[PDB]
């Protein structure tokens, strides 16, 4: 293309995603094509040829459509984002004077499954399972901890924190989970 824009987009699982075809509206478009390359699947397209008003789709059963709009804007829509929607979304606009391309690296935000519990010998476990990206785990009060981060095949990350407190005056502890989808302070009785 004569101008290529590459960007990353993060959208929360289950939400609706709207992607603009280019950084600016392009008036003299003769052809608009979205090429969707999903993780482990053949590519499909949604296209619009301007002169004949010929709309196209080879994305049946992929839940990817043009956005519904009165002015027929070349915006792509994902009505309910699944982890499977991760991939490259490329919009190609042909104008008489040149090609414009916008490539989206679409990333899905996944709230972690949080489990927390006391363990034997004044210990506590706090785990943020299969979050995307990794959650962060901190504690109140600070303890002697071992925290691991395990990434899975799906791209989600399990963060597991196991602590012990050598201050016998401490009876209640709080696990603080931070994530792009949400944050929470979680109490544990030792
Ligand atoms: C932009 O993204 C495309 C598709 O993901 C890639 O092929 C291309 O190399 C990237 N451009 C640059 C300048 O890195
Ligand atoms: C293609 O058709 C859909 C409805 O099936 C419409 O929402 C969309 O605007 C059309 N595409 C373009 C760019 O006109
Ligand atoms: C991978 O992702 C799914 C969500 O799509 C999650 O529920 C699951 O726990 C993850 N897989 C493993 C083996 O952890």
The method of structure determination was X-ray
Range of the domain at 165: 111-190
Asked if residue 97 and residue 18 are part of one domain, the reply reads: yes
Number of domains in the chain: 2
User: Among the three residues 110, 128, 160, which one is the final residue of a domain in this structure?
Assistant: 110
Other CB atoms within 10 A of residue 173 CB: 24
Structure tokens at 106: 């679409």
Same domain membership, residue 128 and residue 78: no
Q: Are 102 and 14 found together in one domain? A: yes
Q: Do 100 and 44 reside in the same domain of the chain? A: yes
**Does 141 sit behind a cis peptide bond, omega within 30 degrees of 0 on the bond before it?**
yes
- 154 Cα–ligand 3 center, Å: 6
Residue 54 Cβ contacting ligand 2 at under 6 Å: no
Q: Which of 100, 144, 105 is nearest to 124 (CA)?
A: 144
User: What's the CA-to-centroid distance between 140 and ligand 3, angstroms?
Assistant: 29
Query: Do 88 and 126 belong to one domain?
Result: no
Angle at 59 between CA 44 and CA 104, to 5 degrees: 55
CATH number of the domain at 61, please. Answer: 2.60.40.10
Q: What's the 159 CA to ligand 2 centre distance in angstroms?
A: 43
Whether residue 6 has its Cβ less than 6 Å from ligand 1:
yes
Ligand nearest to the CA of 32: 2
Dig out the tokens for 184 from the structure.
């929470």
Pairing state between β 98-109 and 3-12: parallel
Report resolution (Å) to 1 decimal: 2.1
Same domain (yes/no): 20, 93: yes
Do 57 and 132 share a domain, yes or no? no
Task: Indicate which residue's Cα is closest to atom 8 of ligand 3.
Answer: 130
Distance from C-alpha of 154 to C-alpha of 98, rounded to nearest angstrom = 38
Answer whether the bond into residue 133 is a cis peptide, omega within 30°. Answer: yes
Q: At 125, which helix (H) or strand (E)?
A: strand 123-131
Contact 50, 116 (CB under 8 A): no
35 alpha carbon, closest ligand: 1
Q: Looking at 110, 141, 159, which one is the last position of a domain?
A: 110
Contacts of 184 (CB under 8 A, 6+ apart): 114, 176, 177
Provide the β-strand partners of residue 31: 49, 94
Nearest CA to ligand 1 atom 7: 103
Q: Are 121 and 24 in contact (CB under 8 A)?
A: no
User: Rg (Cα) of the chain, in Å, rounded?
Assistant: 23
Q: Is the CB of 34 under 6 A from ligand 2?
A: no
Statement to judge: residues 106 and 116 lie in one domain: no
Exposed, middle or buried by CB within 10 Å (0-12, 13-18, 19+), for 154?
A: middle
φ, ψ of residue 84 in degrees (nearest 5): -65, -15
Same domain, yes or no: 151 and 187: yes
CA distance 13 to 79: 11
């Amino acid at each position: 293309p004569l101008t290529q824009v590459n960007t990353t987009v993060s959208v929360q699982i289950g939400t609706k995603a709207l992607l603009c075809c280019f950084s600016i509206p392009l008036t003299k478009a003769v052809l608009i094509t979205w090429i969707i390359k999903l993780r482990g699947l053949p590519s499909c397209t949604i296209a619009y040829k301007v002169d004949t008003k010929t709309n196209e789709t080879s994305c049946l059963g992929r839940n990817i459509t043009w956005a519904s709009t009165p002015d027929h804007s070349p915006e792509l829509q994902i009505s309910a984002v699944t982890l499977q929607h991760e991939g490259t979304y490329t919009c190609e606009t042909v104008t008489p004077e040149g090609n414009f391309e916008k490539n989206y690296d679409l990333q899905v935000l996944v709230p972690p499954e949080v489990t927390y519990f006391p363990e034997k010998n004044r210990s506590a476990v706090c785990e943020a399972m299969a979050g995307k990206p990794a959650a962060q785990i901190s504690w109140s009060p600070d303890g002697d901890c071992v925290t691991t981060s395990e990434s899975h095949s799906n791209g989600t990350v399990t963060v597991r924190s196991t602590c012990h407190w050598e201050q016998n005056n401490v009876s209640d502890v709080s696990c603080i989970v931070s994530h792009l989808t949400g944050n929470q302070s979680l109490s544990i009785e030792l």
